[PDB]
Subunit: 250 residues, 6 copies
C-alpha cells in the first residue's frame, strides 16, 4: 500500500467517526493523529486530552498542552491519581499496564460526556489495556510504520513535536520500592534542577538515603562546575548523599 | 467571545485605518500584526519598516528585513544614529526610552509621507509619557487584550512558521558609548561565537573585558583561553577575563 | 532578490526540464532539490540516485536511501568502484577529478535510460546545480526548507575517506576498513564530527576543539579499541579538526 | 610560647619517667615523640610498639617498622584483634571507644613487662606529652624538621571502621573489599581517598581539587570496583571532608 | 674566589662592627647573615628585626618571627604604617622607593637605641638603603646565589621561606588610593583562595572588579570552586569576581 | 638496620678506598655520595666528574657543574661523543650497553690518572649506597642530616628512548626533541616524553595531568611545529 492509500484509509476512518477524543502526548504519532483529525473532522469536532499526574513532570504536561494549541485544537487536561491503584504504587513489572488501564478509562468517560464515538491514540504497526477501553489506533489499523508517519508528517508541514519520549518516574526506583507522594516529588524536583543547569538527559536514581545521578559520559566533564550546588540542593530535598555514577547514562 | 472577538476587534481597527505603516522587528507579534495588515488591507496599503543602527549587529537587520520581505510586504529599512541622543550616548537607565522616542519619530515621518493613517507595533504588555502614546502609535494586539496564547494561536492559524538585545547592555550605566568601543565589543562577541559559543556576552569595563558564558560551557572554553586573551587584547582590551558567575 | 523570486526561477527551471534525475546524498542541499523537484513534477518524473562506494560509509548510504523514499521519491541505488581507477587508488591530488568524473558519468547513463532531461545535484552559491543558478546561499536553503516543512536530514557533512590518508598512499581494503571502524566507534561515543587520520602505525584523531574536554572520559577505551583494530599508537591531534 | 620552651617541656617530662612505651603509628606526631624519646632516654630505655589489626593496612604497618627501626629504636610488633568484640564488629557509634580501650589495654601490659613508667601516644593540642607541652599542628612540623626528620606517613591512615555506616556488621569480605578499592584508587595517583560501603553502592570521596583530574579514570574504576563486588560505583559530589 | 675567602671577608666585617642590627625577612640571604652574626658576635650583640605592616599578611610576619627565634636570636618586631606616606597611599610608581626609605629609617633608629654599629640587610651581588647607611656584607664579600647555598649547607641551615613574598600594593593599579578596608578585602580574598588549595594566587583589585590570577595549569582544577569563589568574594565587597585568561602574571 | 649502621658502613667503605672519583649527575644520590666522599677523605682526595654529551641536556650539565663546586669538590668536566659509535648512532635495542661502556671507560681512565682506587655512582665501578643497603627513604634522611637542600629534582633519562629502534640519531633531531621537552616542562609538566616519529611528535604525559594540559594545546601545537614537526599529537595511553 502506498502513502496515498493509507492516508486515504485514515481519512475514511476519521470521516466515519465525525467526533473523536484524541490521547495527545506531543509525540510524532499522536501529533499526526491530532493533526489528521482536525484536518478531516474540524476543530469543533475534535477534543484533545493530555494527562497530568505525579508520574510525569509538569514541564512535559505544560509543553504537550501547548503543542496541541499550536495545532489549533480544543485541548483539555485531566489529572490521574496513579498511586491510588496499589498495583501501580507497589512498582511491579506490570505496573505500567494498570497505569494505561486507568488512563484509557478516564478517556472513555470524557468520550461519553463530550459526545465522541471513539478514543484515538498514536499507536503504530511495527497493547493490552488498549483493547478493553475500545481505544482505536488509527495509524496502525491503516498499516503505518515509523517511516510512514514521518513521511506524512513532512507532507503536512509538521516540524515541531517532542523528541523526548518521556519516561515514567517509576524507573528511578528499583522494582518493589513503594512509591510515595513525597519521594516522587523528591526525584522530580532534583531532575528539574539538573535539567535547568543545562543537562536535558539526566536520571536521579533513588537509593533511600542516596541519590545516584546518571549523565551521558560525554557531559560529565561539563558537569564539574556544578558539583557543590547540586550537592547542597539535593541534600535540601531529603537525600543524605548526592553521588554521580561513573558508568554514565543507563 | 474571547479570540473570535479579539481577532474581530483587530480586523475592525485595521479596516478603520485603511493604510498603515508597521514597525517590524521579526518577533512573534510584529509578524502577526504585519500579516494581519496584509490579509485585511493588501500590500499597497501596508509598509513594513525595519530599523538599522550601530547598537545592533550588521546581521539581525539583514534577517528581520529578509523575513518580512519573505512574507510579501513592501519593506523599508531606515537607519537611526541613536548616539545623537545624549541619554543614549552616555547610557542612562532610561536609554531604552529615548531610543523608542527616536524610532517612533522616524516612523511617523515615514508614515506621514506615504499617506498612512497610523503606525502599528506588536506590543502586548517611564521618564514621562509612553513613547507609543507620545507618538500616536497604535498597539492593536494590546488593545484587544491578546495574551501570549492568543498570539500563539493565530500564527499557526494563519500559517506563520518562520519568525525570530541592544548592545548598550554590554556597557555600565553612565559609560560613554563611542563608535570605536561598540565595534570593539561586537567584534569580540562575533569572534567568540565563531569559536562555537553562540550565547555569550562581552561586558565592557574600559580596560577590562568581562566574558559571560553559560556555566555549562566554561569547561569546553578552556582550550581557547590564550587565543581569546590575545585576540581581545588586539581589539583594545588590556585585560581579558571570564566571569565566574556565568551568563545571567 | 527575495526568496520567493529565487523559488520561482527554481520552479520555472524545473518545469522546463519536466523529467529529471537527482543526485541524492542526504544533506540539506540535496534534500531541498529532491523535495522541490517532487513538488513540481511528482514521483513520476523524478528519479533519486544514491551512490554506494568504498570511500563512503554504508551508514550514510542506508540512511540516504531511507530519507529519499520518505520524501516520496522512487529511489535507485548504484555502486561505484572508485578504487578501480588507478588515480584514486594511489591517492594522487587529482583523485577528486576522476572520482567526480566516474560518479557523474554513471548518473548520466542512468538519466539517459529513464529519459531525464538533466542530472541534478545540490551545489549552492559560495550536471546542473539549480539552487546555485537561482543564487541560493546557505542562509536561503535553511529558510526555504523550514517553509516546506523538511526536517530529518544528515546534519554532519559527508566526506570521501581518501582525505584520511596522505597523498601518495595506496588505499587498500584493509586500511580503509580500519579507518571506518575507528571513526564509527568514535561516533557511537557521542562525537558526530571526527576524523581518524591514517599514518601507518599511528592513528591521529582529529576532533573539534570544543569537544576535546568532553572526550577525556573516553581516552582509555578509545586507545584499546583502536589498538585492537590494528593501530599501534592512538593519538589526539592537538590542532583539532582541520 | 617559643618552640624552644616547648621542646624543653617534654625533655624534662621524658627525663622524669626515664623508661617509656611509645604507641608508634607512623604519623608525624608519633614519629616526633619516639625520636624525642631516644635522644633523651637512649635506645635501651625506649620501647616502640605497633598494633597490627584487621582495621588497618599492611602498608601502614610495614613502613611503620622500616621507619621505627631506622630511628634507632627497639621496635617490636604486637597483633590486636578487634571485631571479635561485640561493639566493634557491628559498628555501633561506640566502637571507637572499645577500639581505644582494647588497644590501650595491652600497651599497659606490655609496658609493664618492660619496666617502663608510662605509655605515650601522639596526641596534640597513657601520656600525651605533646599535648602537655602545648604542641599544635604547626609546632610539631617545625620541631620534626629541626630534628632532621624526613620520613613519616603524610596521609592520615584512619580506621577502616569509618568507611561503614552505623549498624552494618563488618566481615573479612566487607573490609577487604573496601581496602582493595582504596588500594586501587591510590595506585592511580589519588593518595587521599575514601571508599564508603553502602551494600551494593560504592561512594568515592576525593579532594575536590582532584576530581577534575579524576575524569580520565572514570571507566576503569567503574569496571574494577564492579569486579570487587560493588554493583554501583559513584563519586560523592561533596568530596573528601 | 674560594668559599673560604668570601667567608673570611664576611667574618672579619662582622668582627669589626661587633654589634649589629639585622633586617630579617626569612629568606636564605637574611638567614645566612643572621646565622653568621650569631656565630661571630654572639646572641646579646645581635638584634633581628622583622617589619610588621598593613601591606603584608600577619602570617608571613608570624613565620619570619619564629624563624628568627629558631636560629637562637633576640628578634623584635616594629610596626610601620606605610600608608602614612602619600607616595605609598596613592600607589605611585616610585612608591617602592619611599616604602624602603621608611623601612630603613626605622631600623637606624633601633640601631641607635640598642647601640649597634651598623644595620645589615641580605643583599648579594646579583637606592634607598644606601642613603640610610645600611650594610650588605654578602655583597661586599662577593657572595653569589650559589655561594649562599654553599655556606648555608656548611652551617646546617635547611629551613627558610622558599617563597619571597610581595607587598599587596602590586594588587592595585598605579594611581589607586590604598585604604585599610580594600587592603583587607584583597588579603581576605587571597587568603581564602589559598585555603582551597591554590598557594600561588593573586587577586587584582579593580574597584568593583576582582581579577583572579592563577597558574594556567591549575585553572582546570579550579572550575569546581567557581561558584563558591564567586559568592565569597562578593561577600567581601567585590561586585564582579573574574578569572584572568592570561593567568598568573603576564 | 638503623641509619647509623649504614652511614657507618658507607664511611667504613669510604675509608678503605682512601682516594676516589665520583660520577656526578646532579641527582640526590650522586650528591649524597659526593658530599660524604668530601666529608670523609677531603677535597684533594675526591674528583667529581660530570659528563657532557648530546644525549643529555646542557641544562642538566650546567646544573651539575655548579652544584658539585657548590659542595666544595674540585670538579672536572668531560665530553662524551656518543654518536661516534654506530650502535648508539643508529639506536639498536642494545645501544644502551655501548653507552654505559663508553661512559665508564672514560671515568676509569680519569680515576687512574688522579690516583683513585675506584669509581662510584649513586645506585641504590662501586655502588656504595647499594652495597650498604640504602633505600630512597634513608637517602633523604641522611641528606637533610648533612644540610643537603639543593639538587636536580627531575631525573633525566637518556634521550635515546625518544627515538624508535632503527632511527638514526642526528645533531638536529636530538635538539628538536630536547627543545620540545624543555618547553613542556616550563609550562608545569616535569614528567613528559616527546616521542620522535619523523613528521609526528607523540607527546607522553601522565594520565592524571591530561586534563590540566588542555589549556596549552594550541600553544604546544605551534611551538613544536616551529621546531620541525608537522603534526603534534598526544598519546591516549599516557606516560608509559
Ligand atoms: Zn558619531
Ligand atoms: Zn562539553
Ligand atoms: Zn612507529
Ligand atoms: Zn589537575
Ligand atoms: Zn595604616
Ligand atoms: Zn651551558
Amino acid at each position: 500500500a502506498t502513502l496515498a492509500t493509507k492516508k486515504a484509509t485514515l481519512v475514511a476512518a476519521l470521516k466515519d467517526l465525525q467526533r473523536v477524543t484524541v490521547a495527545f502526548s506531543g509525540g510524532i504519532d499522536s501529533t499526526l493523529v491530532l493533526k489528521m483529525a482536525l484536518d478531516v473532522l474540524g476543530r469543533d469536532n475534535v477534543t484533545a486530552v493530555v494527562a497530568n499526574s505525579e508520574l510525569f513532570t509538569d514541564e512535559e504536561f505544560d509543553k504537550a498542552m501547548s503543542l496541541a494549541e499550536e495545532l489549533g485544537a480544543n485541548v483539555q487536561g485531566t489529572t490521574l491519581d496513579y498511586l491510588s491503584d496499589d498495583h501501580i504504587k507497589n512498582n511491579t513489572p506490570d505496573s505500567w499496564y494498570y497505569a494505561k488501564k486507568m488512563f484509557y478509562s478516564r478517556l472513555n468517560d470524557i468520550a461519553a460526556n463530550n459526545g465522541s464515538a471513539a478514543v484515538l491514540d498514536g499507536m503504530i504497526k511495527n497493547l493490552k489495556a488498549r483493547s478493553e477501553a475500545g481505544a482505536r489506533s488509527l495509524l496502525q489499523e491503516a498499516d503505518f510504520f515509523k517511516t510512514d508517519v514521518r513521511a506524512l508528517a513532512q507532507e503536512l508541514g509538521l516540524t515541531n513535536w517532542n523528541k523526548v519520549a518521556s519516561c515514567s518516574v517509576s524507573s528511578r526506583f528499583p522494582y518493589g520500592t513503594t512509591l510515595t507522594h513525597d519521594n516522587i516529588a523528591q526525584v522530580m524536583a532534583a531532575e528539574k534542577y539538573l535539567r535547568s543547569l543545562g543537562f536535558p538527559t539526566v536520571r536521579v536514581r533513588f537509593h533511600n538515603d542516596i541519590a545516584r545521578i546518571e549523565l551521558p559520559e560525554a557531559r560529565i566533564g561539563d558537569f564539574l562546575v556544578f558539583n557543590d550546588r547540586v550537592n547542597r540542593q539535593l541534600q535540601s530535598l531529603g537525600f543524605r548523599y548526592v553521588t554521580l555514577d561513573l558508568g554514565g547514562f543507563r
